[PDB]
Structure formats: C-alpha cells, structure tokens
Design a protein around this ligand. Sequence first.
Ligand SMILES: CCCCCCSC[C@H](NC(=O)CC[C@H]([NH3+])C(=O)O)C(=O)NCC(=O)O
Ligand SMILES: CCCCCCSC[C@H](NC(=O)CC[C@H]([NH3+])C(=O)O)C(=O)NCC(=O)O
Lengths: 239, 239
Amino acid sequence: GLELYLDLLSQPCRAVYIFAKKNDIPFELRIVDLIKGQHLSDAFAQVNPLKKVPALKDGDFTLTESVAILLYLTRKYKVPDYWYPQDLQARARVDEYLAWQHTTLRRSCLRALWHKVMFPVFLGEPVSPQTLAATLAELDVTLQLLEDKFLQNKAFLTGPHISLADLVAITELMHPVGAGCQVFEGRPKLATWRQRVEAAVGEDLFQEAHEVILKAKDFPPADPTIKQKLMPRVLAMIR
Amino acid sequence: GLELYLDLLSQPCRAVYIFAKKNDIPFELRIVDLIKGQHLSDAFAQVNPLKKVPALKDGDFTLTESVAILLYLTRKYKVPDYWYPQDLQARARVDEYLAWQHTTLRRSCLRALWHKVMFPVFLGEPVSPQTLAATLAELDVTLQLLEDKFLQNKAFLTGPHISLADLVAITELMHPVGAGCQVFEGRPKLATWRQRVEAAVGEDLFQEAHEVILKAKDFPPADPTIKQKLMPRVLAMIR
Ligand SMILES: CCCCCCSC[C@H](NC(=O)CC[C@H]([NH3+])C(=O)O)C(=O)NCC(=O)O
Ligand SMILES: CCCCCCSC[C@H](NC(=O)CC[C@H]([NH3+])C(=O)O)C(=O)NCC(=O)O
C-alpha cells in the first residue's frame, strides 16, 4: 500500500515521480489537481493536514517533504548507490545541495513561474514589470551559484554520476523553462549537464514528467471561488 | 584536523556547536565575527566562497550547510544513533523536520531577530510597525505548526527521544528569545519540550552556546563603513 499524492505541475512532485518510476518502485498514483484546488478538500486534508503536495502513504505511515520522501524511498527500496553514495564526503555533497536549494533555487524557480505566468495567466493578476525584473535577476544569481558552487567542472552536481541533488535541481530549473525563461541559453555547462541528466533518468520519462509544467502557459484562468481560496496560499508560498 | 568556522550569534552555528561539543567531537573552533564583517574577508572567502557560516573544514574537504555538517559529523564520529535513528520511519521523521524548517521556522526566527532588534539597534535602520507585525504573525503561525504538525503529544519532535530535529528547532527558537519575543510564554507544550532538550543537551552547554544571541540587544551599532558592507548581505538574507 504505497501511495504517492502528486501533481506534476509542482517541482517537488516531479522529483519524486521521476525517482520512483526510474527505480521501478511500485506505487499507486493519486493525482491531486492543484489548479482545481483538490489539495484544499477535506479528503486531502486527512492525508496531509498541511494541504500541500507531495505526500507519501506507506501502510499507516504518512510522510511529507520531497527531500524526506526521496530519502525514504532510496533506503526502503535499496536503489543503486549513486543516488545517495555510501562514501562519507559524496553523501555530504548530496546533503549540501539538498539543504542549500530550499531557500535559494527552489524559491527563485518558483517565483519565476508565478510572476511571469501563473499570476497573470491562471489567477488573472498582473505583476509589475519591476517585480518580474527583480525575480529574473535573482534567478540569474541562483543559476550562477548552481554553476560556481555545485556543478563547477564536473559531469553532475556532486560527482561523476547522477544523484538525488541533480534530480531536485533539474526539476526546479524546469519551472522557469515552463514559464518561458531563457534558463539554459548562454549557459553551455548547464545545457550539457541537463542533457546528461535527461539520459540518466531516461529522456522519455523526463519528457512525460514535464508535460504539465511545459503547458502552464495554456492554462485556462481560475474559477472566482478557486482564485479566492488559492490567493492566500499562493502569497504565503511566493515570499 | 577538523575545524569549525562559527559565530554563535547565528542559529545554524549554535546547532553545530552544541552537536560537536555534546558528542565530544575534537575540533578547532574558528570564530568568524559577523558583526565585524569577518565573513567578507579575503581569508574567510578562501574557506567558504559563499561567505557564510557554518563552514566545516576537515583536511582538504570543505562543507557548508548546517544540516549537511550535522549529518557528516553524525556519520564520521559514530555518535549515538538516537540523533539520527536507524529505523526508516523514525529517520524519515527527522528528515521531514530538517527539510520543512528551511523555509518556515528558520525564516521566521531569522526575520524576527532582524525586524525587532538587529536592523534598528545594530544597523540603525527603522522597520515599519507593519513589517514587524507581519513578521511576528508569521512567527506565531510557524510556532503553531511546530506544536501541531511535529511535537503534538510527544516528548520530542520525532518521538520519545531527542534527535537532530530538536537541536535545529531549539536553536532556531532562541533567535526570537534573544530579540525579546515571548516565545515560550503561553505555549506550555513548547516550554516543557525546551526543558527536556536543555536537560538532554546539558544545561551548561545550552547556556554557553546561547551567550551571544541573548546579548544581541546590547551590540554596539555598526559604524557607517561596516553598515555599508553588511547592508546588501543582510537584504539578501532578509528578502
Ligand atoms: C494552482 C497552484 C496552487 C499552489 C501552488 C502549488 S506549489 C506546490 C506546493 N508544495 C509545497 O509547498 C511543499 C514543499 C515542500 N518543502 C516539499 O518539498 O515537499 C503546494 O502543494 N502548495 C499548495 C498550497 O500551499 O496551496
Ligand atoms: C551580521 C551579519 C548578518 C548575518 C545574518 C545571518 S548569519 C547566518 C548566515 N548563514 C547562512 O545563510 C547559511 C544558512 C544555511 N542554510 C545553513 O543552514 O548553514 C550567514 O553567515 N550570513 C552571512 C551573509 O550572508 O553575509
């Protein structure tokens, strides 16, 4: 009874989805449709009281946080070593990235998607161009840190092989890709890394997991009641 | 040997300090004085190019991020396993808290200190009552989530014993305590939990680690050159 409560629109759900499918981990997929406000229902509030996705249920055990969910599945299903290496220092490099991204690249990628596309297209709320400029400037800074602090001259973020870190980072970078931002343009080292990550994960799986975010621009505007319920949740999300 | 680059004024450094000292981990303490902008010096930039503390140095290996540092020390020095339990679901509970706090409690506790004390006292910069109110209301939301999602009816955040999760949370909560917020007042579940954490950590060590944050209201204001150097760093920290 392993169940993953996911919406492929969100960066953390894509990381969990790709991981579980790549490693042939059997699970029931429960799609929690975020644009319909399904995560705000009483039925989802029973699974996760915080009313957020991804959420994991394994028997009677409930787990939140994509980093925790990824580590739980890594250990329980005994996946290959490269995802979270046995080696003390390689493991630490994975921990370093997973910790760093929460307050930096996660935030920057999220704010890029919402200020450029999901506020004016989906919630019908225009964003000032000064706010959008500042957001994309901050995106540039985090992308530069991704290159200079993590990737540097290596094949992958923490070493010669893909790890949990590369999975979290690539699903994050696809948020502004879906928003139409020039993420990999003029960043050749990131561009070749993306292609290496796509191959390690499986290109077909990569494409499949990113079908929803790549069409975020074509979302019909929200329902006036749905917009009302989602607005404080989104404002607390974007900070 | 092992070197820990710390400033006990900051929440993540206190967590690392308390962990290394409680577990009798031999290290060389390198105080990096934030108030004097020592983290911005060319000498510290060699240790950590990101110019932030805590930073670990163990020979040719350098590590950032307090969560990564705590886990690396956990593993290398074979500390008691209650800090990071071997049981999969208990270890997940620790991972769940460590992941959650980065964008919620860490952020509120850091903003409480800066908007209530460190901007007006140390940097001579007034904060609007509206900004401070917003910050302290968000702190109350995170304190309620700490109680309702994590601590609940248990002795500690993840079960019957202390873990790395309690260490991160207690050092976070002492940031608004040092700013003069009535954190444990009217929250009896948190107040008794604090007493259990202090008892488990050892009261003398707990007090030693918190000597600087409890004196933050009395820091002499920065001169105009130090202020000018620290202001863009502080604004990137306080978004
Ligand atoms: C139509 C879009 C609705 C809102 C945007 C969804 S972004 C995804 C977001 N997920 C989280 O905030 C959990 C983050 C957590 N740190 C993790 O990694 O698991 C969520 O479900 N948040 C939902 C919410 O807070 O309302
Ligand atoms: C009085 C100076 C103001 C410093 C405020 C915060 S001190 C803590 C801060 N450290 C971090 O941002 C690292 C956080 C990281 N997520 C961790 O847990 O280690 C820092 O060294 N920041 C220094 C900087 O960014 O300049």
